[PDB]
Design a protein around this ligand. Sequence first.
Ligand SMILES: CN1CN([C@@H]2O[C@H](COP(=O)(O)OP(=O)(O)OP(=O)(O)O)[C@@H](O)[C@H]2O)c2nc(N)[nH]c(=O)c21
Length: 161
Amino acid sequence: ISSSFSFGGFTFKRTSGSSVKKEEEVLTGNLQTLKIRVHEGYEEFTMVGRRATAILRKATRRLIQLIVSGRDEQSIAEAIIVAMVFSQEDCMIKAVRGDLNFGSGLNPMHQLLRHFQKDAKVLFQNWGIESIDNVMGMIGILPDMTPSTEMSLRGIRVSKM
Ligand SMILES: CN1CN([C@@H]2O[C@H](COP(=O)(O)OP(=O)(O)OP(=O)(O)O)[C@@H](O)[C@H]2O)c2nc(N)[nH]c(=O)c21
């Protein structure tokens, strides 16, 4: 199991928890079957990139929290997309529209990744929103990337730092 690695342009370091991997079949929003290696366990990570940084808390196919800071709207969105994919949420697999086609060297995680970096509107619209507590140093972010002190994309918060 890996504890430091790169994915989606970010450097990940596990800061607590553990996991195991299990091959599973999942069904996209277009009813295409993918085989992915699902991580089971609660883990926390730092994600660091050129234009954004985050703390990610995740469990088995579940994003628990993402606290993200970044240079601008597009950079923050890029980090959110990678976190959503990395979480392996079925919500995210079901947000695929059309087929995921072959590319040499691209495993299904990177197929998903490629798909949503092209256009994340369906992912953002179908992920879920939640009411948020007013917690110091954080704010919500809505599907359309606007700030909110009242609501947010589920599990997602934006920090200054
Ligand atoms: C969802 N992931 C993915 N991941 C690790 O992220 C790494 C990068 O994912 P990737 O590029 O799909 O993997 P790669 O090295 O190409 O192969 P593979 O995904 O099959 O391991 C892999 O080592 C993978 O096991 C994880 N590592 C931990 N600890 N916890 C996790 O939840 C996850």
